[PDB]
Ligand binder design. Structure first.
Ligand SMILES: O=C(O)c1ccccc1Nc1cc(Cl)c(O)c(Cl)c1
Ligand SMILES: O=C(O)c1ccccc1Nc1cc(Cl)c(O)c(Cl)c1
Lengths: 111, 115, 115, 111
């Protein structure tokens, strides 16, 4: 598991559960090609997106579907989605995000 | 000025100066059309991106060029950009300030929206 | 104004208005002596806490009364306060802006320090 | 384990390892009484601070020794320490912090 995504909720003080996450890899013609996707678990985590063989160097985008998350909770949000764009460089990447209705924090833990 | 961007540096404790910012707007055909661009001043602020007339309803993407910022400082950072995507003006005109606080492997972003 | 505090609300996307702020300075005997206090304006800013003369070197604690803020809004939050503790003016006078971005169970804080 | 502390480093993209953490509980005369302490592990986490029997309702302060962390890395920091003050209310509390030299983010995950 070279890539993990973890999402937290700063309003409820909880994991952000059942958040849709879409990963894309940038193609040679600069378009974004679907790569992997899933929904966060009860712990706010999404494991199993990819494998070491399939996760080659390149630019990736992780699109967290925050708008739908907030609406399912009855809350009015600002962003369409949170976006995390980075280069994978030859390590286990954890992309974390801490969500509020009008704000988000994101970090990477690369170990 | 209905759209302002402010960027801060969490390593130095300072405005993030000379940060390039590109704004896009989603077109009818669902592509990201160029909308405006500029770079932050010595206060970390970027004013003058657009006008009340040109800033219509739509889905906007504010792309803050954080990798280019850190690289100009001699630092290899994690993210390519910070990308702030939001629907604007769908209840009438509003004024938006998009703020970001930058570190090499992390950022925060918020919005202040006023009527 | 060598010390300014700015507070934003990450739920509403707005300044955090009417936030009480208490500043303390560590005394010789290691207790926290009162130094200044005030509350944020309609822009989320608090100016006028102290003067160049009174703002000497020392260890300062800026206590932002976030629980009192959220409770006044009818919300039960996690933290009692946000507490920003730092050495000031130890290389000569500087100007400090302490900023905070508030959510019910979380906050961020940064400093902008200028000469 | 009713209380866990996790600390991350936003400069290096890593857990913040060997950070000293001191917990205090507010006493009846409003002083802060030492309660528990430890150092974060290789994962940035500090487990085993207290037990359910010893962690009663009250106001607690978690003081993360960020200044010494940054100095051991050769970096010049702003804060003396990060402070997280909260009421425990009768759940497993995780206090997380994301550190930069001039800034920190903190959240609670209460599950
Ligand atoms: O908004 C300002 O004018 C500002 C001025 C100084 C420092 C920060 C500022 N904003 C800000 C933005 C984020 Cl994203 C954040 O996390 C925190 Cl704590 C603050
Ligand atoms: O909580 C975790 O396990 C975690 C794991 C890896 C990276 C970050 C983590 N949490 C976290 C905490 C804060 Cl204060 C924050 O702002 C952001 Cl974005 C994330």
């Amino acid at each position: 598991c070279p890539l993990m995504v973890k999402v937290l909720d700063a309003v409820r003080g909880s994991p952000a559960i059942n958040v849709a996450v879409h990963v894309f890899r940038k193609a040679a013609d600069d378009t974004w090609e679907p790569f992997a996707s899933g929904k966060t678990s009860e712990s706010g985590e999404l494991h199993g997106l990819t494998t070491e063989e399939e996760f080659v160097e390149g630019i990736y985008k992780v699109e967290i579907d925050t708008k739908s998350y907030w609406k399912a909770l009855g809350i009015s949000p600002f962003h369409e989605h949170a976006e995390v764009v980075f280069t994978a460089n030859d390590r286990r990447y954890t992309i974390a995000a801490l969500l509020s209705p009008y704000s988000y924090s994101t970090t990477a833990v690369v170990t």
